[PDB]
Amino acid sequence: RKGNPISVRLGKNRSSDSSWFSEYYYGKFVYQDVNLRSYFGSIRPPTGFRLGRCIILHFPKRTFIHFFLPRRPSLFPFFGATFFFLRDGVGVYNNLDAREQLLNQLRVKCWNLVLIEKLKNLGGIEELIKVIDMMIEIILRKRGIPYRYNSYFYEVKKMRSFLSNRTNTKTLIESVKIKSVYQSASLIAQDISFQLKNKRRSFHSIFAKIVKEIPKGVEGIRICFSGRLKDAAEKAQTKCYKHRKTSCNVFNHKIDYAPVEVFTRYGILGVKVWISYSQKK
RNA sequence: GGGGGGGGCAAGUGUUCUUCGGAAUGACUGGGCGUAAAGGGCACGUAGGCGGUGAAUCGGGUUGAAAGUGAAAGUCGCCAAAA
RNA sequence: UCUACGAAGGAACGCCAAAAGCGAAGGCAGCUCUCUGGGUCCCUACCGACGCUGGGGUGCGAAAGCAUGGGGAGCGAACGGGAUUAGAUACCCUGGUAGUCCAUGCCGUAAACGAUGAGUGUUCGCCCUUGGUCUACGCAGAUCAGGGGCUCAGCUAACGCGUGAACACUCCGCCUGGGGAGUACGGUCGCAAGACCAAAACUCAAAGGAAUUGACGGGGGCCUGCACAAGCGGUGGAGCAUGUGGUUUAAUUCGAUACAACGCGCAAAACCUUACCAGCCCUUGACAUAUGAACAACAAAACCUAUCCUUAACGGGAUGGUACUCACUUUCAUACAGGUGCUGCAUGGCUGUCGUCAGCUCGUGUCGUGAGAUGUUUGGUCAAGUCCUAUAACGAGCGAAACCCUCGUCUUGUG
RNA sequence: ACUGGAGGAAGGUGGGGAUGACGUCAAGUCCGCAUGGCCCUUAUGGGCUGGGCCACACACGUGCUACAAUGGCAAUUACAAUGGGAAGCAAGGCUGUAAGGCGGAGCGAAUCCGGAAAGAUUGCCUCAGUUCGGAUUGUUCUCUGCAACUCGGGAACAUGAAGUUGGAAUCGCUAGUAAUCGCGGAUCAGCAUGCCGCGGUGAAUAUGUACCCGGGCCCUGUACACACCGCCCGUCACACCCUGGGAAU
């Protein structure tokens, strides 16, 4: 009785997130999918600050990953000619330019050290060049302590290290700014599960913010709560709000649903969100 | 119930007793009695209450005026001293 | 029994007939006659304000009851049996006296109920209708007394009345929470039964009226489901397998409990699974962070591929070898880790459930002082609040349908 | 809208699934997971073996087997579908009465693997407690595992409980369904009378709302609102309290 809207719509509406196939490894691909969905959540979400849908793809030694982030509040066996053709186009910290600036002012910021140990050393050195390039390169790798490079989030490099090391495959991680924030359902759930965490907030104010900002062509929003409500602390009960088009017995209706559970030390409260998308726009 | 904190009053506070008000909750001012408590089983009739007109008279009630009295203290208005 | 005629009696009065009529009220009817109360109509004559109500008082006052004397058909308390039931003083049957009836007396009470004191004046109408009166010219129009509906307004907490429960009036009786209680005491009246005046102690925060929703009903009023009906086969009897109810120790682990638990978690108990029971031990623990007193290694130690030995097993004891980290997991010590420990009457999630039932509702509008009513209350259709029709609602959401897949027929395309 | 009729392979939701409102029942489970609160912190914690979860005077539930001759058995022959297979499915040959054993063509699987059972042909039976019926019930054995006395299947052969349609009741079903026929997975070394799926064969009956039953409507009545398994009256037994009559005073 009363299924959710996932198990019906995979036939027509939705494409399941991943896309691949195995015969012997399926048993170790369903897990490399589920645990990684567990990951991408609980990654500096304090507040919201960070969310996601994370459509993934697996190829034979290639793995595509595409997050979805809202706004912050010759010889042919040179196959490099088609690999970096596609594993490059980010622009996330195209360190070419800031590295260029560091290259420019590097001469000064090092040559001014290299004259109590500059001229004396030049005397002893041009008396006694590659081995001098050794007492030269000692200071290039001194700047582990002071360092002025940057990145919006090179955490992409960070994870393309972690997982490619522990899985042994060529990987690609991108993030795309989902502009119209939380038109999805997992996003809305992740959101209101933050305001319900400290400090406390109003249900009616949450729904007022919702009807304030979100109704931009979304067909309807049906939202339920549950838990030890405010505030008799006994007899946990339910309440739910509705809107124009709130249907699930009708097919061909992308209506995404993902509950969540956050607490108040008085037991736990849990919300559910059943949005409905205007189809055929 | 205990710790802390705060409100109300203040050389006074709180409980009980005591009487009025709220209490139109005995209703003259200020009610009800069909279904809510309350119209008698019904009438008769005694006092008793109350109850047509116009004309006349009297002046008991009625009413207008004066004095006596309605102790002083009290209530109250003012005034002044008193703190 | 019946069937025709008779006789005896008693008792009530069929139809008319009547929300009709008469009475002050209780009441009153087969008929005829004597006597007799009150009434209304009527030119109107007189008469003259003599009226209205009415404390204590006075009569009347159904039924049952009492007294004395009649009568006793039928009915029928009490009682008898047939019954009926777990039981039956009952309801059901058959008997059946007192009683019903008449004569006179006694009580003096009834839901004596329009549950509405009595009287006077003023009030929009319509419909009637009992009996009077005036006027009649196709026929009624008018006017009085009443009896009965329906209404304008007015009032009412609500229903409702409107011959008032309206607008006002005078008089009478009474009420002041429920219970205790119309009880005790007491005074009168009665042959008795009893009647009439009639409290309080004590006790509670309620007792209650009308109306709304909802449920309910061995009540109507439809309509429907292997529910029943037409069926066909099964558990219940025997033997086994499984599960639970039980009782048995050391355990017979635990949760499930009408449809909606019990071949259920279980999609799989040798040990393991396993919480349960005994031995066997461990306790910063198998596991996690920080924790530095530590120990020192710039490679020790540990630690681990393999050999040996003991432990019912865990281990453990070696014993090589491999193997290294300036971090040692390596050490004890800590803060702790942990608990299939308790709690679903704290919860989330999940599920069963009514039920694939067709019913749930919302927004404005109205109506209701209000709770709430309307939309979904009409005639039909549907498997459906599916639909049309009607409509003070107009609409929307949820639900249903169709969307989905599948099979079935066929079309094409890769083969 | 209904009734037919047409075509059509399908006629009026063609059949099946899927999909399951408000909400109700403090329904279920803190023993899956998560979680509040409360307790133990050499213990209710961790691990090891043993032993227990499998018993039994006992009732109840679900499933299986049949009492037969529409049949039990032996030899002949006919027809599936799903599916499953690398801790794997394994043809053939050889070996064992057989269960088992030796080894292996192919197959990670439209290609390799898999005697369908009913049914049908003949014969035996000839109506028995039986050649129907098989629990209990002996010896040999064997599969796994390190390990089969309490505590997994499997084969040989002998024994052969009750059972002759099973009370009252009560349950399941309206056409590929009932009933039976097997076949195939599932968890898993060892395993199904259980569960999930697949196909063989295959009807009874449609009187329809009279009835009991169940549900809805709406129309009435209610003292019910924990909503009839509701409220609720009265005697008696019980405690405390108050009060009346009452001889005599």
UniProtKB/Swiss-Prot annotation:
Keyword RNA-binding (UniProt): no
Keywords assigned: Mitochondrion, Ribonucleoprotein, Ribosomal protein
Transmembrane spans: none
Biological process according to GO: translation
GO MF annotations in UniProt: RNA binding; structural constituent of ribosome
Top-rank taxon, per record: Eukaryota
Single GO cellular component term: ribonucleoprotein complex
UniProt keyword Oxidoreductase present: no
Main localization of the protein described in the UniProt heading: mitochondrion
Subcellular location field: Mitochondrion
Family of this protein: Belongs to the universal ribosomal protein uS3 family.
Subunit note: Component of the mitochondrial ribosome small subunit.
PANTHER family per the UniProt record, alphabetical: RIBOSOMAL PROTEIN S3, MITOCHONDRIAL, SMALL RIBOSOMAL SUBUNIT PROTEIN US3M
Name this protein carries in UniProt: Small ribosomal subunit protein uS3m
